[PDB]
Amino acid sequence: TTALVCDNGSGLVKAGFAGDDAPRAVFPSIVGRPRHQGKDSYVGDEAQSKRGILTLKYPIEHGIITNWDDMEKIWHHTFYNELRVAPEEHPTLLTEAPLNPKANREKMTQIMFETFNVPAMYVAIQAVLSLYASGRTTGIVLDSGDGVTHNVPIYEGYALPHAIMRLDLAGRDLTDYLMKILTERGYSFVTTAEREIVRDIKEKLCYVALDFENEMATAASSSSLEKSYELPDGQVITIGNERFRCPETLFQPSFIGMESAGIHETTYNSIMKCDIDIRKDLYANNVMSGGTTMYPGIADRMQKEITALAPSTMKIKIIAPPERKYSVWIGGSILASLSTFQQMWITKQEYDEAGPSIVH
């Protein structure tokens, strides 16, 4: 029948069916369990509503699944509650973060077949699905989500693992950063509940500056960059340089006390780590994906930082599709919908015969 596509995000799970232009369900990648009197599980929004009597967990904190009991809860919810289907009836395409350990990929496969009894299954790299979504098989993706951000160079459809760059900094950290400066200005943002207020402020008012210093000076000598936000308690916090200082972190991690390279540098390094005979293709196809790549000005800023690092001859092109927030999912949707892809679904017959290592 129809294939299922589940993008297991570190912050949000995007789920739906292959052939759709968008994910039917997108919910918080969280699982809550009864806290006292030692049902007995809640996923997504529900888990959040009832935080008061549950202990929440993040099974995919930084892109990698670290808790299998919890993950079984996400997938159960996805299937039966969100999509409302019997997993045994549909082949399932699952996405995984770049550099996911083999044993991890094998346990995901073990669960799908033994726990959810799916007829067929497949595991693809998120970044690669995003490139696919843009109509390319070669290119270099910059995927910045909630818990982690990756640089993934891809040639003829295959990711180049040795050149993959990882930055443990994404949207979640951008929110924690803005939350910090805001609490310092006097507005109390502490609880996770409250943090959701800041996150929303982030998404609606933050942007990337083409030149941090020029922008910084404008904010200091004018009020033309000021925007206002009404808090749920009625207060009207207004912000200026924190509007672009927050995202600036992606380019300068030191704002968060990290000595790691910024996203423009990690992209350059990832390129330079690749066969010199394909660097032009990468440079010409830098595709951005993920919710943290939605900031206004991020594309222009990348184009500037990269042209400055690469050789003057080089043609630098940054691709940032409007559906950026769902490129991965859409990549899987397109893939798992193809005709020629059907010979790719690891089947239970194959799994029952060779084992979990059949996935590689």
């Binding site: 994910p23 109509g135 390319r136």
Partner: peptide
């Protein structure tokens, strides 16, 4: 034997008209 599958798959991805994709919602 299977590279032809991948090969053809790569072709199907490069020529895929993103529409023809059921409008979710």
């Amino acid at each position: 034997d299977l590279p032809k599958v991948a090969e053809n798959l790569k072709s199907q991805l490069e020529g895929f008209n993103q529409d023809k994709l059921k409008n979710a919602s």
